[PDB]
Amino acid sequence: PTDKELVAQAKALGREYVHARLLRAGLSWSAPERAAPVPGRLAEVAAVLLRLGDELEMIRPSVYRNVARQLHISLQSERVVTDAFLAVAGHIFSAGITWGKVVSLYAVAAGLAVDAVRQAQPAMVHALVDALGEFVRKTLATWLRRRGGWTDVLKC
Numbered sequence: 634p635t636d637k638e639l640v641a642q643a644k645a646l647g648r649e650y651v652h653a654r655l656l657r658a659g660l661s662w663s664a665p666e667r668a669a670p671v672p673g674r675l676a677e678v679a680a681v682l683l684r685l686g687d688e689l690e691m692i693r694p695s696v697y698r699n700v701a702r703q704l705h706i707s708l709q710s711e712r713v714v715t716d717a718f719l720a721v722a723g724h725i726f727s728a729g730i731t732w733g734k735v736v737s738l739y740a741v742a743a744g745l746a747v748d749a750v751r752q753a754q755p756a757m758v759h760a761l762v763d764a765l766g767e768f769v770r771k772t773l774a775t776w777l778r779r780r781g782g783w784t785d786v787l788k789c
Contacts (some may be wrong), residue, residue, distance in 0.1 A: 636770050639777045639779050643769040645671070646679050646783075647762045651746040653683055654690075655758075662755075671768055686740035694708040698744040708749040708757045715764045718742065722765070723772050730776045732786045739765075 656662055690697045701708065706717045726734055744763045749757035769777065777783070 635731070635778055636774060638782065640770045640772060642783060643680070643766045643777075644762060645675060646682060647739060647742065647765050648692050650681055650682060650743045651687070651758050653693060654687070654743045655747045655750050657687075658751065660751060662750070666670065674782065674784050674787075677787050678719060681787060682736060682739055685736050686743065689741065690740065690744075694744075696744075697740055698717055698748055700741055702744045706745065708745065708754050709753070711756060711760050713762050714745075718745075719764045719768055722768050724740055726768075726772060734789060735786070 645700060652662070652664055658665075667671060686697075696703060704717060704721070707713045722738060725738070746757045746761050748756075
């Protein structure tokens with residue numbers, strides 16, 4: 634147990650995130666249509682990240698849809714996008730996870746995924762989500778395990 638909370642949660646968050654900005658930006662996308670039961674905590678955190686990211690991205694985001702190029706992530710491949718994303722993540726998180734870093738992080742991930750999807754390469758969606766979760770249950774595992782849950786991020 635425990636680890637499942639971070640993985641399941643982290644995944645749900647990212648998933649809905651990318652899909653949100655993806656379905657909002659354009660394109661069809663019917664989604665995996667895999668509904669499921671969810672408490673108020675999860676929905677709370679997810680929403681917070683959505684409104685937060687969306688809002689900022691609506692005002693004037695630094696690089697919520699281009700940063701990838703700044704590092705030539707190359708969405709063409711999967712190992713390059715995963716390794717690169719995992720690196721920048723664990724790197725910026727290694728100096729302190731915190732809640733802020735998370736918000737900005739997820740936001741960026743969604744941007745790259747969306748772009749790829751529109752550029753005929755939705756693979757980034759599953760790739761990013763995978764790296765994110767694993768990175769959250771491997772590097773952030775202890776962090777989220779010590780905090781008890783993401784509910785704390787709601788206090789802000």
